[PDB]
């Protein structure tokens, strides 16, 4: 449990201190309200925003950077689909993605260790669950 909690706390700090700090990133902070953007959900089948990512982190959805990056990269993919690649929204989404990748890279050593520990704790719990299943 301790490694997963630490990993989640680190991901949350990247979201609030780096990604939400990107200038003009406010349109990405919360889910789109269709009352302001009427056809958003007709175009975007897999919506994503920074609040949803923080909610996912609170629930410990991410065990590795790969699953975290899958949701982060959706923010950029959704913007290119809805706004076009040339849009100022897309430029902001790219800057949110950039600061995320750059921050994760600066934490590479410690995040690799936490990911290995999360995986080790998971595998050990599953082996124990299988052995005790006949009790
Ligand atoms: C999360 C990813 C979506 C990014 N995004 C956002 C908006 C956008 C969303 C909202 C909105 O619904 N809000 C505000 C934030 O709090 C919740 C309610 C309001 C907006 C907006 N643009 C101008 N206003 C006044 C927009 C418009 C055209 N393309 C986009 C676009 O790609």
Decide if 15 contacts 119 (C-beta within 8 A): no
The sign one gets for the Cα dihedral 109, 111, 116, 117 is: positive
d(CA 13, CA 108): 15
Q: List pocket residues of ligand 1, CB cut-off 6 Å.
A: 27-28, 30, 32-33, 36-37, 49, 79, 82-83, 89
What DSSP assignment string belongs to 45-88? SS---HHHHHHHHHTT--SSHHHHHHHHHHHHHHHHHHH-TTSH
Indicate which atom in ligand 1 lies nearest the CA of residue 28. 1
DSSP 8-state class, residue 26: G
Decide if 63 contacts 120 (C-beta within 8 A): no
What would the two tokens of residue 48 be? Answer: 């994503």
**What are the residues whose beta carbons fall under 8 Å from the beta carbon of 103, sequence distance 6 or more?**
14, 18
Domain-wise residue ranges, the chain: 1-135
Give resolution, Å, one decimal.
2.0
The approach used to solve this structure was: X-ray
Indicate which atom in ligand 1 lies nearest the CA of residue 49. 1
The domain made up of 1-135 has a fold known as Histone Acetyltransferase; Chain A (1.20.920)
Q: How far is CA 100 from the centre of its chain?
A: 9
Ligand 1 centroid from CA 101, angstroms: 23
Backbone angles phi, psi at 90, to 5 degrees: -65, -40
């Amino acid at each position: 449990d301790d490694d997963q909690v630490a990993f989640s706390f680190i991901l949350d700090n990247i979201v609030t201190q780096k990604m939400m700090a990107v200038p003009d990133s406010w349109p990405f902070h919360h889910p789109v309200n269709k009352k302001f953007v009427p056809d958003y959900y007709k175009v975007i089948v897999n919506p994503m925003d920074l609040e949803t990512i923080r909610k996912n982190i609170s629930k410990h959805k991410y065990q590795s950077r790969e699953s975290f990056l899958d949701d982060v990269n959706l923010i950029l993919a959704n913007s290119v689909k809805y706004n076009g690649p040339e849009s100022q929204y897309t430029k902001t989404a790219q800057e949110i993605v950039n600061v995320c990748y750059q921050t994760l890279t600066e934490y590479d050593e410690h995040l690799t260790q936490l990911e290995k520990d999360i995986c080790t704790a998971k595998e050990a719990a599953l082996e124990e669950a299988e052995l005790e299943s006949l009790d």
